[PDB]
Amino acid sequence: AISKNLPILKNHFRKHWQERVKVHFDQAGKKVSRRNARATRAAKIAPRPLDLLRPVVRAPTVKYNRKVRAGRGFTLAEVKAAGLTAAYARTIGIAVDHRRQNRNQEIFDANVQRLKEYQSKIIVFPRNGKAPEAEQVLSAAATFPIAQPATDVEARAVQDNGESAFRTLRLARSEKKFRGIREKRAREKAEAE
Template sequence: MYHYFFLITAIAKNLPLLKNHFRKHWQERVKVHFNQAGKKASRRDARVAKAAKIAPRPLDLLRPVVRAPTVKYNRKVRAGRGFTFGEVKAAGLTPAYARTIGIAVDHR
């Protein structure tokens, strides 16, 4: 019965705590980011290619221009989440149809 106690305890006897040494092959695990400039150029080329492919249409949905909330940011204008149901209805469209022609609609 006494020897089972040592099997379930984590540290037994007067031995030093292990100091694991995992620094032997660290060169194999180094990840470098020397491809940042190349990836940036690739992303830009992909954006330009997509814009050329869908030529007269915009790349993203049409969104309203809104002013950011709070005193800190309210001098800035930015793209909103989408037009409200009332705004879409005033334009003579249904929300479902507006979504199909590339207009963002905010359902809140």
Template sequence: MAPKGNNMIPNGHFHKDWQRFVKTWFNQPARKHRRKQNRVKKARAIAPRPAAGPLRPVVRCPSVRYHTKVRAGRGFTLQELKAAGFNPRFAQYKSKLILFPIHNKKKLRAGEATEEERKVATQLTSEVLPIRQPAIRTKARVPTEAEKTFSAYITLRKARADARLVGIRAKRIKDAAENPDDVTKAAKEKKPAKK
């Protein structure tokens, strides 16, 4: 587009070597396929252990905005494991898993699976303990008279005023107790409204 008016003619740099700076993403489908193959290979290597990773606790998200949701936590604290009576490494695969012995020829230790239990074992490919959001359903009901007359705005304003005036009111009560003869310190009576 030609410049309008008595302005400078734009100098467009149209001969830059742009192909050096362009990033392409043509290998995305192949990378996706390779990642899937690697997941399958890892699952076969660690079978019959779960491929989904270690057990994680269910925790609530921080902040008022997200605290209604639950998600998988980073892990159990050492205090929680100690209270449950578990060694931190042993606790990773304790619940709902068949514990294979480290050495097949040696005597089985406490908690390790027998030969029959090991034959039954299958690999779990899904999540170990899936997280489900709790459904909170409230039943419909008729509001009470107190709920109908309740005003959140007035309640908050009164609470703010009470918090602001707590020192002044305490001083006024203390002065009135010390000087009962002083008329200005005593509580003033409200005048009747004129008709």
């Protein structure tokens, strides 16, 4: 059961795996079934946009922190800074997430602007009569995209203080390495002179 020169494979079918096969024959069938059921929301939903307005957000970890994408909802802090109540901003087709927090002015600023730009681009039909027939827009996020803030300019002055950028990386690492031990050498130091 072991022969020639081949990778070892771990091919995992030792249970009754033929029971748990799932084939998508409905790939096409469900694309249609969900395209109708989208365009049949676009009707039943009236001129409303079909989605909710989403915040700018900095992506987590170290891999994706470089980027930004739409978050869940708008942080009561921003809903108030854009000047409306949360409970109302729900019914304006703004999504408000009460869990998110603002540690970033630059993101908080970005998100309030994005909020006013929406209040300006929308028309709120009044409670009773009128309805100046409005021709629904199919997205919000397409109307109101997200692009990555520019971190720099094109070209700029070479400014060299000769600190090698590497030497910096080493020391910054060492400083963290012997840190608690240099505090132990400021404590074993503290009690005897």
